[PDB]
Structure 1
Amino acid sequence: NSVQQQLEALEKSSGGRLGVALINTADNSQILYRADERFAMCSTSKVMAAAAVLKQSESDKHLLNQRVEIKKSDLVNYNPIAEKHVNGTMTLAELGAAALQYSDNTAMNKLIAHLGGPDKVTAFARSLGDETFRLDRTEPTLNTAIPGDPRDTTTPLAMAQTLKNLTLGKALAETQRAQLVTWLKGNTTGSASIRAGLPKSWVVGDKTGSGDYGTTNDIAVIWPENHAPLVLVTYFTQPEQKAERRRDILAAAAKIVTHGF
């Protein structure tokens, strides 16, 4: 069909490899493109870590208020919130918000450590029935995005299904689900990615990521006017280590797959 042809042409023109999974929750119809192929998640993996802490808060109502010390040695390559709290503390809620809304890599490492390591983030994914997601490394090395490296990868379809389950389905109890959605809706890094291909009237929660190999990612829950939500994963990557980030490709893919709503 013409949608598939447009995605093929977009990928061909890009020089890279495009992965798209759109789930239309009105009827669970899907638009898929390379949706069973692995892609490095980069900072999009942070949704799984934040959600795992939210799950824990179902059994400890006040867990999100618990404080975590931030030390100079904790700082990694991109720390916009954590660097302001060195030799102080952040709450787990502040760490979740920093990880998701500002893509703070130190905050992600604090979440990973809290949970018991990358393997435990993976174990949480498994508890949601996601057998595809794997987190293997901490920040910043989980963003290497090396072609053919299975570490810190998932598929667009597995991630769309999981994002749907987390934000709209039964992965989290209601208060926790609502908290995750609030965080994603407050993202500060996603206006040039999926959002840029959608009507301005639509409400969006998303989490972006980027990496080496010009890896450019975004995962989103989309609330169109007068319609059931859509869940969209757009992963993009290029064959050269130092290729530039291409958020415009994600915006273009988002526009191609969301007509008619």
Structure 2
Amino acid sequence: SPQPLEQIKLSESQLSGRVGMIEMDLASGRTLTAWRADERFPMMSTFKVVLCGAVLARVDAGDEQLERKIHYRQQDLVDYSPVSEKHLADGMTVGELCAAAITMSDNSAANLLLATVGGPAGLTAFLRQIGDNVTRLDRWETELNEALPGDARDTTTPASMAATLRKLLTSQRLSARSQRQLLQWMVDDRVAGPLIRSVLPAGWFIADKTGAGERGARGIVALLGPNNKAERIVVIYLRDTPASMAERNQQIAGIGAALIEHWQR
């Protein structure tokens, strides 16, 4: 494979779309690869990691409990609710909601949680509290995936999202137990985690959250490294490409292949 930057460029050529990418050391925050790092991309379901960071901050402060059971109604549900649609009668705990949002991309679970943090505006305020002055959430599921060309709503930048993930996972803004919980939810992703493992060489750690939207939007926020260690944050977003889902997946994986082959930088 090409060097990572050259593979990223080839992916833009091939997709006709914009790619944004950061590769960052998790422990130190060193930026390794950066491409369109300050450009905006729709977050799509990748926002759900930040969402559950805000939930966990409430838990640490004594303002929420992961045990707390939320009852909700069928008329509340939005498109794609594989877990939450099963619990109309008995409800779900806040922690179960975060697990369904992160590990199954359950959209209604995400909206229920978003309401507990004060909606898109409240999650944006949480981002500002942790020093992310760029990432913004404006809408709920599923409109936040619309990815209109040139629309700043519901966007992050690769640099912002990488720095924010690192803050949530490592900076002691969250309690030790809450940092461990957020990481385990990403480890447990069922949407893409098993598929990624099936194509990773032996020894490579993965934890992730993926997203998809209109006009080719696609993204992943992940932890990756050899020796079974979460060594680096890797954030990749794609936008404004007409390519098939399969080809967008393949191009993201090809960037991953370049990272794996040129890991020592």
TM-score by length of 1: 0.92
Change beyond 3 A, Cα 1:173–1:199 = same
2:168 maps to a residue whose letter is L
In structure 1, C-alpha distance between the alignment counterparts of 2:102 and 2:123, rounded to whole Å? 15
Deviation at 1:249, TM superposition (A): 1.5
Change beyond 3 A, Cα 1:3–1:184 = closer
Change beyond 3 A, Cα 1:29–1:197 = farther
2:18 maps to a residue whose letter is R
2:244 maps to a residue whose letter is E
Change beyond 3 A, Cα 1:193–1:11 = farther
Superposed CA deviations along residues 36-68 of structure 1, whole A, max 9, x for unmatched, are: 110000000111111101011112287111111
1:153 maps to a residue whose letter is T
1:152 maps to a residue whose letter is D
Matched, 1:9 2:10: yes
Q: Which residue of 2 aligns with 1:260?
A: 263
Deviation at 1:256, TM superposition (A): 1.6
2:71 maps to a residue whose letter is E
**Secondary structure at 1:208's aligned position in 2?**
strand
Matched, 1:235 2:237: yes
In structure 1, C-alpha distance between the alignment counterparts of 2:13 and 2:63, rounded to whole Å? 49
In structure 1, C-alpha distance between the alignment counterparts of 2:26 and 2:90, rounded to whole Å? 43
CA RMSD of aligned residues (A): 2.1
**Secondary structure at 1:222's aligned position in 2?**
strand
TM-score by length of 2: 0.90
1:244 maps to a residue whose letter is S
Change beyond 3 A, Cα 1:178–1:84 = same
Change beyond 3 A, Cα 1:25–1:140 = closer
Change beyond 3 A, Cα 1:22–1:73 = same
Deviation at 1:20, TM superposition (A): 0.7
Deviation at 1:199, TM superposition (A): 2.9
**Secondary structure at 1:184's aligned position in 2?**
helix
Superposed CA deviations along residues 183-237 of structure 1, whole A, max 9, x for unmatched, are: 1100001248865764342221110000011211100112421767100001012
Matched, 1:189 2:180: no
Equivalent runs, 1:133-148 vs 2, <5 Å: 133-148=135-150
Contact 2:4–2:255 (8 Å) recurs in 1 = no
Superposed CA deviations along residues 98-121 of structure 1, whole A, max 9, x for unmatched, are: 000000000000011111110101
In structure 1, C-alpha distance between the alignment counterparts of 2:257 and 2:130, rounded to whole Å? 30
Deviation at 1:159, TM superposition (A): 0.4
Identity %: 38
The count of aligned residue pairs is 259
